[PDB]
Amino acid sequence: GCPPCESCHSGESTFWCYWEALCPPC
Q: How far apart are CA 8 and CA 1, in angstroms?
A: 20
DSSP state of 19: H
Q: How many domains does the chain have?
A: 1
Way it was determined: NMR
Q: How far apart are CA 26 and CA 3, in angstroms?
A: 7
Q: How far apart are CA 19 and CA 15, in angstroms?
A: 6
Domain that holds residue 4: 1-26
Q: How far apart are the first and last CA of the chain?
A: 8
